[PDB]
């Protein structure tokens, strides 16, 4: 099967209590899983069959799209946590973020606003846009900010129902609290440098 | 203002096919949300003194996604009943059979496209200008309505919060269930003013 689905860096019950492992288990295994098989079953006998992932969502539309693009943001998303992460940035990003928000509660308040006020299916970013300043994006249900060619992602957090919906039913609030006790800047710090350069 | 309908029913009667714990999240917090939000965001506009269906007309954004989620779920509450389900009776079957060949061609049909909708949305039965039934789907808080394709008949929400805690991802089981709830009463009410 051309599209693999990549593994985790981390346990399933890595992130626990902030996100559960029953959530990965469904959302990794389940959802992220889902959306591989069915890309490839959907890639067959099209051009896109030898294209990568990227190459995939950057150049389909419809059903093929939105499982291409859905894939890679999961991924972009898993990335984006980890056990032993959260707390204060690091390295550059503690900079830069220091640079085009003022301090990292000023982004925390902001990228939380963000997250919590999206209406239906979507995803919260953190990207360096065209201007190589970082701003805070939304897209929604499987858009991403390389589709829309709006800067460069750093980070994601998936703000779909099924991301929260067994560990804080309605309470999207309070996923997106507890998500900032995963929050990887080893991974964001990974994505500035090549994205800067 | 906006106040949020009463159920026809109550909050365990649709289970175990919707549970009581679905229902109380659905009602009481989503579509309740709905309307606190709406009533916030309307004080001292012009929306204030306009009906929900006015507002869902003549909105976009914020207000729109408020006011027609509002509506939208008390069309789908009334949508479902206990003692409902199976076999569609009285007027609403003999159009099926006039539209769709079968209740079975339906029943397929709808439930496919309800599995199919990426993302947030819902599915409809509508009945058109022509006087026929067609089936629709909508994304997020769009309905028929806001989009004039014709007169709702039906509806069954397919956002994740609508099955989540019963089903999981396998939304296929949730709508194989709604077949067990679906209002034909409600639907025949509704084409009877339709046509
Ligand atoms: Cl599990
Ligand atoms: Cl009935």
Redesign the pocket.
């Known amino acids: 099967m051309a599209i693999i689905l990549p593994k985790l860096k981390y346990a399933l019950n890595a992130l626990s209590p902030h996100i559960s492992?029953?959530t990965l288990?469904?959302h990794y295994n389940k959802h992220h899983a889902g959306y591989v098989n069915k890309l490839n079953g959907l890639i067959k006998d099209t051009p896109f069959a030898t294209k990568s992932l990227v190459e995939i969502m950057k150049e389909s539309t419809g059903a093929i799209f939105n499982n291409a693009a859905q894939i890679w943001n999961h991924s972009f998303y898993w990335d984006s946590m980890g056990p032993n992460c959260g707390g204060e940035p690091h390295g550059e990003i503690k900079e830069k973020i220091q640079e085009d928000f003022g301090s990292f509660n000023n982004f925390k308040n902001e990228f939380s606003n963000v997250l919590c006020g999206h209406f239906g299916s979507g995803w919260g970013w953190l990207v360096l846009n065209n201007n190589n300043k970082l701003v805070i994006l939304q897209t929604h249900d499987a858009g991403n900010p390389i589709k829309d060619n709006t800067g460069i992602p750093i980070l994601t957090c998936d703000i779909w129902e099924h991301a929260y919906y067994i560990d804080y039913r309605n309470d999207r609030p309070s996923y997106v609290k507890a998500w900032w006790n995963l929050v990887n800047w080893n991974f964001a710090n990974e994505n500035l440098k090549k994205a800067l350069q």
Request: aromatic share 24%.
């Open positions: 492992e029953e288990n469904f």
